[PDB]
Amino acid sequence: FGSGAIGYEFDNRYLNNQEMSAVAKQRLTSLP
Amino acid sequence: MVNNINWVKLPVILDRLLRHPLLTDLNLETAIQYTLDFISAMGLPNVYVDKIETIDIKEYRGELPCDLISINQVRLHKNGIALRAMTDNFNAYPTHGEPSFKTQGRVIFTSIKHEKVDISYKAIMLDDEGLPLIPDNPIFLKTLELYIKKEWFTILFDMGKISPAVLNNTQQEYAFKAGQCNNEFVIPSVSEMEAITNMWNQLIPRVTEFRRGFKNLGDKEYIRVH
Spatial separation of the C-alpha atoms in residues B218 and B82, rounded to whole Å:
18
Q: Which residues contact B38 (CB under 8 A, 6 or more apart)?
A: B143, B144, B147, B148
Chain CA centroid to CA B131, Å = 17
Secondary element (H or E) of residue B118: strand B115-123
Give the gyration radius of chain A's Cα atoms: 16
**B18: distance to nearest CA of chain A, Å?**
26
Q: Is A25 part of the contact surface with chain B (CB cutoff 8 Å)?
A: no
Spatial separation of the C-alpha atoms in residues B116 and B85, rounded to whole Å:
17
Chain CA centroid to CA B158, Å = 32
Task: Report the SS3 class of residue B16.
Answer: helix
Chain CA centroid to CA B190, Å = 21
Length of chain B: 226
In B, which residues are within 8 Å of A23 by CB distance? Answer: 160
The answer to whether B168 contacts A29, with C-beta atoms less than 8 Å apart, is yes
Residue ranges of alpha helices (H) inside chain B are 12-17, 28-42, 138-159, 164-186, 190-200
The answer to whether A26 contacts B164, with C-beta atoms less than 8 Å apart, is yes
CB B98 within 8 A of CB B137: no
Cα–Cα–Cα angle for B191, B195, B199, nearest 5°? 160
Spatial separation of the C-alpha atoms in residues B146 and B173, rounded to whole Å:
7
Q: List the resolution, Å.
A: 3.1
CB B62 within 8 A of CB B111: no
Residue ranges of alpha helices (H) inside B43-163 are 138-159
Secondary element (H or E) of residue B75: strand B70-76
Q: What is the CB neighbour count within 10 angstroms for residue B185?
A: 21
**A9: distance to nearest CA of chain B, Å?**
22
Pairing of strands B70-76, B115-123: antiparallel
